[PDB]
Amino acid sequence: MGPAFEFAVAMMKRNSSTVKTEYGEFTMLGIYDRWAVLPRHAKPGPTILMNDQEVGVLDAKELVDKDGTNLELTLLKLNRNEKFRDIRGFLAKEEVEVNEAVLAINTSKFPNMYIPVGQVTEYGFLNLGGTPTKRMLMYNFPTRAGQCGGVLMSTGKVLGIHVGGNGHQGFSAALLKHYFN
Amino acid sequence: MGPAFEFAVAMMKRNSSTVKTEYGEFTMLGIYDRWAVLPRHAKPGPTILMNDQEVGVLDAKELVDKDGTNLELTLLKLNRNEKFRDIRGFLAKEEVEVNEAVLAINTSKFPNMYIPVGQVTEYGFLNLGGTPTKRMLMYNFPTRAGQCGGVLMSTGKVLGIHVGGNGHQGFSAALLKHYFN
C-alpha cells in the first residue's frame, strides 16, 4: 500500500491536472505528447478548463472495442505547447490485476486525495448505467460522486480511470498501452 | 510518505468512526476506554450518531490552556459498552513536527480518503476564525470544507486533529498525551 501511495503521489504531481467541461470537474491524466484521457462522461467540448485556464481540444475519441462496445474512455488532444511526460511505459498491454491499489483524485471537490481500494480484479463486462461496457476493473470501497476520472494505480503501474461506483464497489476502465498511437 | 500512509490506514480502520452532531458530520478518533476526540466546532450534544447509530454522550470537555485560551478540541465520553483500542502511546507529550504527514478523513463526504500534507511545523498561536487559539500545527495543502476532524498522522505518531484551513494552509490542534487521564 505504501509504495503504491508514494508512486501515486509522484505520478499525480507530474502528470495530473484538474479539468472542467460543461459536464463537470474531472481529474485528468496526461499520457504523452498532448494526448490525455478522461472518463467518457466528461463529454469534452471544443474548449476545456485545465487548471483554470482555457485550452482548445483538437480531437476527442470516444473509445469502443471491435464490436462497437463502449470502453468508457475519451482520449483528447490538447492545443498546448507543453508536452506531457511520456507515461506509456506505465500502461499495461492488458487488464491489470493487483493486490493493493490506490485511487488518486485531484479536483476542487477532492483536492489531492488518495483512497486505498485494495485488490483490483478484472471484471470485464458491465452494464454501466444502461450502457454495455467492457474491460472494467473492479475494486471495493465506499464510492461517492465526483470521483469520476480518478486514476487507479499500484506500485509502478497505472491501471485505469475510475468511471463508476455503486455503494461499495467501484469500476475503472482499463488504461491500455495500445490506445496510445 | 508510504509508511505514514500505511500507518494512517491501519489506525483509521482500528480507531476511527464517522460521527454526526447537529453541527455536521466529522471524523472521530477514539482514544482509550470510551473517550474520543472531536474538533471543538462539532459541539456535540447529549446524543451523537456514530456509524449511523445513536450514542449517548456522558461528558464533553472543551479544552482550554491554563490561561483560558481555546485549544479547539472537545473530548467526549461515550455511553457504549465497547472500549477503544488504547492509542495513548501514539500521542506525544508536546507538539510534534515531522517531515512527512498524512491527513486521514472518514465521512460521507470524504469516505476513507488520505491526503499527503508534507511537513508539519509547530505554529502555536493563531487567531482561528476570530478565536485566539494555541498549540496549532500547520501544514500546506489545498484545504476544503468538511475536512474538520481529520486525523493528522506520520509513521507511528498521531499528531493532531484538523480544525481549520485557509486556501492552501491547514491547521491541526495538537493531540497531547496528558489530555487523557
DSSP state letters, B16-33: EEEEEETTEEEEEEEEEB
Asked if A100 and A165 sit in the same domain, the reply is yes
Q: Give Cα separations from B157 to A4, B32, B59, B97 (angstroms).
A: 21, 16, 26, 10
- In chain A, after which residues does the backbone break, taking C–N over 2.5 angstroms as a break? none
Domain boundary among A32, A67, A84: A84
Residue partners of B6: CB distance under 8 A and separation at least 6:
A1, A2, A5
Per the structure, the count of domains in chain B is 2
Q: How many CA atoms lie within 13 A of A107 on its CB side?
A: 19
- CA B15 to CA A99: how far, in whole Å? 24
Do B141 and B169 sit in the same domain of this protein? yes
- Contact partners, residue B7, CB within 8 Å, separation at least 6: B153, B154, B155, B156
**Phi–psi pair at B84, nearest 5 degrees:** -70, 145
**Sign (positive/negative) of CA torsion A3, A4, A9, A14?**
positive
Residues of A in contact with B3 (CB under 8 A): 2
Contact A113 B111 (CB under 8 A): no
Nearest Cα residue in chain B from A2: B2
Chain B residues contacting A via beta carbons under 8 Å? 1-3, 5-6, 9, 108-116, 141-144
Q: Residue A102: in which H helix or E strand, if any? A: strand A98-105
Which of these three, A50, A67, A84, is where a domain ends? A84
Q: Does the distance separating the beta carbons of A112 and B112 come in below 8 Å? A: no
Per-residue HEC secondary structure of A20-84 comes to EECCEEEEEEEEEECEEEEEHHHCCCCEEEECCEEEEEEEEEEEECCCCCEEEEEEEEEECCCCE
Which of B5, B112, B116 minimises the CB distance to A112? B116
Q: Which residues of B touch A143 (CB under 8 A)?
A: 111
Give the count of Cβ contacts less than 8 A between chain A and B: 59
Handedness of CA A166, B107, B147, B151 (dihedral sign): negative
Which residues of A are annotated as catalytic? 41, 72, 148
CA B19 to chain centre: 12
One domain, residues B181 and B140: yes
- For B9, phi then psi, to 5°, come to -65, -50
Same domain, A127 and A55: no
First to last CA, chain A: 32
Domain shared by A90 and A175, yes or no: yes
Q: Å resolution of this model? A: 1.7
The span from the CA of B150 to the CA of B41, in Å, is 13
Q: What is the 3-state secondary structure (H, E, C) of B54-109?
A: EEEEEEEEEEECCCCCEEEEEEEEEECCCCECCCHHHECCCCCCEEEEEEEECCCC
The residue to which cell 508536546 is assigned: B94
Query: Domain end: A60, A84, A108, which one?
Result: A84
Question: Residue B94 CB: number of other CB atoms within 10 A?
Answer: 11
Q: Which residues of A touch B139 (CB under 8 A)?
A: none
H/E segment holding residue A105? strand A98-105
Query: Same domain, yes or no, for B126 and B96?
Result: yes
Q: Are B9 and A116 in contact (CB < 8 Å)? A: yes
Q: Using an 8 Å Cβ cutoff, are A103 and A49 in contact?
A: no
Mutate to test the interface with A, among B1, B109, B113 (most CBs of A within 10 A): B113
CB atoms within 10 A of CB A43: 14
A167 shares its domain with A138: yes
Residue A174 near residue A135 (C-beta atoms within 8 A):
yes
The whole-angstrom separation of Cα A176 and Cα A136 is: 12
For residue B50, give the CATH number of its domain: 2.40.10.10
Instruction: Tell me which residue of B19, B34, B8, B29 sits closest to B113, measured CA to CA.
Output: B8
Choose the closest CB to B2 out of A2, A110, A115.
A2
| Residues of B designated as active site | 41, 72, 148
Whether residue B144 and residue A108 make contact (CB cut-off 8 A), yes or no, is yes
Helices A2-15 & B2-15 angle (0-180, nearest 10) = 120
Q: Provide the grid cell at A14.
A: 507530474
**B24 and B9 both lie in a single domain:** no
Provide the β-strand partners of residue A167.
none
| CA dihedral of residues B14, A118, A8, A134 (deg, nearest 10) | -150
CB contact under 8 A, B109 and A1: no
CB-based contact B112:A115 (threshold 8 Å) = yes
- In the three-class reduction of DSSP (H, G, I as helix; E, B as strand; rest coil), residue B175 is classed as coil
CA proximity to B72, closest of B140, B147, B131: B131
Q: CA-nearest residue of chain A to B2? A: A2
Concatenated DSSP letters for B101-140?
EEEEE-SSSSTTEEEEEEEEEEEEEEEETTEEEEEEEEEE
Question: d(Cα A174, Cα A155) in Å, to the nearest integer?
Answer: 16
* A96 and A175 share one domain: yes
* Residue B105 sits in the same domain as residue B179: yes
Q: Of A7, A114, A162, A169, which to mutate for an interface test with B (greatest number of B Cβ within 10 Å)?
A: A114
Contact A42, A33 (CB under 8 A): no
The residue whose grid cell reads 498546448 is: A80
CA proximity to B9, closest of B105, B110, B98, B140: B105
> Can you give the residue range of the structural domain that contains A93?
1-15+85-181
| Inter-residue contact B172 to B148 (CB < 8 Å) | no
Say how many C-beta atoms besides its own lie within 10 A of residue A90's C-beta.
Answer: 17
Regarding whether B91 and B64 lie in a shared domain, the answer is no
DSSP symbol at B178: G
Option in B112, B115, B143 nearest A141 (CB): B112
Q: Which of A5, A108, A111 sits opposite B1 (nearest CB)?
A: A5
B78 and B139 in a single domain? The answer is no
Q: DSSP secondary structure string, A109-154?
A: SSTTEEEEEEEEEEEEEEEETTEEEEEEEEEES---TT-TTPEEEE
